[PDB]
Design a protein around this ligand. Structure first.
Ligand SMILES: [Mn+2]
Length: 537
């Protein structure tokens, strides 16, 4: 709660008459204080209105004796936001949302998912997929593999030279990739309006048969198998539901799914809509249930192994002696002391059910203002989220994503629509983009400039600032500071303890997580390239 209007009057009292902008503050404060309603949103909006009115005063009367008391008010307002979001608080909808789009869901992922279902029988499992787009990953691989071969043939004389700059390969390949995506897309555009009303998979299958020497029967049985496999396993179809309720988000989803072949970005969109509409918990398929706090509370962690690695080996232990998941790595566990390896066996064998090893979600109490998110390396990471349907912050994130894409597309579209190659298209995009640079948005611009090569070239990481963690971190900034449309600033893990995915409720250091956190950096690029050259021979 905030100081009364009367208290502010006393605190900010001065020899001067009350400025008009000061009277407004007093009114906004009083009206906040007199809020009878207990809906979190309406309190928030009034707090926001008060805060804005304070900035108006302070920016106009920069030397006012009142500024100290008003600066103190603004500090109290920051705390009031946290008090509100922590006020009314009840369990999220009992939905676990996963997403596997663009191909056949792996068995490996089904196993990880199975663990959650077993432990939380009262939770509905939603495995989102796109019934029309099972061939999207197949197409992306065809394009990349074809382009790799084209680039290696072109650069055949140079690639073996150990001093070869592998970037020359990646740039060259990107040109071939761009031309092939553009060929696909233009063909898609010619088909999609016919009275036959073809699907994405119809169009991809035909293109693959025509241009990539594929067999229709093989493609078709992969498609029908992917469909039944996913329907049999909590599968829920994006196309038959109410996820996409307006054209703008659909188009963002489609440009990622169809034009770029970026399934991670597509999934970034789907997870947010699933949360907005249904509420619940979202998880990547490499996340696992949290382990009971006191399970290995009696095993001292050696100084030689890190905090993270210790969390990994805990999972590996559970897995060597319960094999809940097939072929779970034992690398880190096999070592080193033969004592703890038995203390591990002792405690794990002393349990008989899975629910004794893993903790249940039960009620996750959140308010209708918030979204909770996992952390990694000091940043938020959207591989795990909790949110009530229609939550204020989840909408803030969606708005961030929409405005970032609106900006991206404003500059990108004219370049795409032009009939140009990769290099010329890039230039038209960059020349428009960087002419919009301000102090405020410069970094963001620099981050989205390599958008077209995301997934295909090293260090192209635009997704983060578009549909990924960067959009969430700016939305968190919006929310904490009662601002809107923040792009320059992000809030970090250390800023957001009040919004953390409760640690006890999640195990992030899983085997599939780690061998998935592969990033397209230089080092990884060097290795991929060396593999490419070794196979080519
Ligand atoms: Mn991962």
């Amino acid at each position: 709660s905030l100081i009364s209007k009367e208290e502010l009057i006393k605190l900010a009292y001065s020899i001067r008459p009350r400025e008009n902008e000061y009277k407004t503050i007093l009114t906004n404060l009083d009206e906040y204080n007199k809020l009878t309603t207990n809906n979190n949103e309406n309190k928030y909006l009034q707090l926001k209105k008060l805060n804005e009115s304070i900035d108006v005063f302070m920016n106009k009367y920069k030397t006012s004796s009142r500024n100290r008391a008003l600066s103190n008010l603004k500090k109290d307002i920051l705390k009031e936001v946290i008090l509100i979001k922590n006020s009314n608080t009840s369990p999220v909808e009992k939905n676990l949302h996963f997403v596997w789009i663009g191909g056949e869901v792996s068995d490996i992922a089904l196993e990880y998912i199975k663990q959650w279902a077993d432990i939380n029988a009262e939770y509905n499992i939603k495995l989102w997929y796109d019934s029309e787009a099972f061939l999207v990953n197949t197409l992306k691989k065809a394009i990349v593999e074809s382009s790799t071969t084209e680039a290696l043939q072109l650069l055949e004389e140079e690639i073996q030279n150990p001093q070869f700059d592998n970037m020359k390969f990646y740039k060259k390949r990107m040109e071939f990739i761009y031309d092939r995506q553009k060929r696909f897309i233009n063909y898609y555009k010619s088909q999609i309006n016919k009275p036959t009303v073809p699907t994405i998979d119809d169009i991809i299958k035909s293109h693959l048969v025509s241009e990539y020497n594929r067999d229709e029967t093989v493609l078709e049985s992969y498609r029908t198998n992917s469909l039944r496999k996913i329907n049999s396993n909590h599968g829920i179809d994006i196309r038959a539901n109410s996820l996409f309720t307006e054209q703008e988000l659909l188009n963002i989803y489609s440009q990622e799914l169809l034009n770029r072949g970026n399934l991670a970005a597509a999934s970034d969109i789907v997870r947010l809509l699933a949360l907005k509409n249904f509420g619940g918990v979202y998880l990547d398929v490499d996340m696992l249930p949290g382990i009971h706090s006191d399970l290995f509370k009696t095993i001292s962690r050696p100084s030689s192994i890190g905090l993270d690695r210790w969390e990994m080996i805990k999972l590996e232990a559970i897995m060597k002696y319960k094999k809940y998941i097939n072929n779970y790595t034992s690398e880190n566990f096999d070592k080193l002391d033969q004592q703890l390896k038995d203390n591990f066996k002792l405690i794990i064998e002393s349990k008989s059910e899975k629910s004794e090893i893993f903790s249940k979600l039960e009620n996750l109490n959140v308010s209708d203002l918030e979204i909770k998110i996992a952390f990694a390396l000091g940043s938020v990471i959207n591989q795990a989220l909790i949110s009530k349907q229609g939550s204020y912050l989840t909408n803030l994130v969606i708005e961030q994503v929409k405005n970032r894409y609106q900006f991206l597309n404003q500059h990108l579209n004219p370049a795409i629509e032009s009939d140009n190659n990769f290099t010329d298209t890039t230039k038209i995009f960059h020349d428009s983009l960087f002419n919009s640079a301000t102090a405020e948005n410069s970094m963001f611009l620099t981050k989205i400039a390599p958008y077209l090569q995301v997934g295909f070239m090293p260090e192209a990481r635009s997704t983060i600032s578009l549909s990924g963690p960067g959009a969430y971190a700016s939305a968190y900034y919006d929310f904490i500071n009662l601002q809107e449309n923040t792009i320059e600033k992000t809030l970090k893990a250390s800023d957001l303890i009040e919004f953390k995915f409760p640690e006890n409720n999640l195990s992030q250091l899983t085997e599939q997580e780690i061998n998935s956190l592969w990033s397209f950096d230089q080092a990884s690029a060097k290795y991929q390239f060396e593999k490419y050259v070794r196979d080519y021979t």
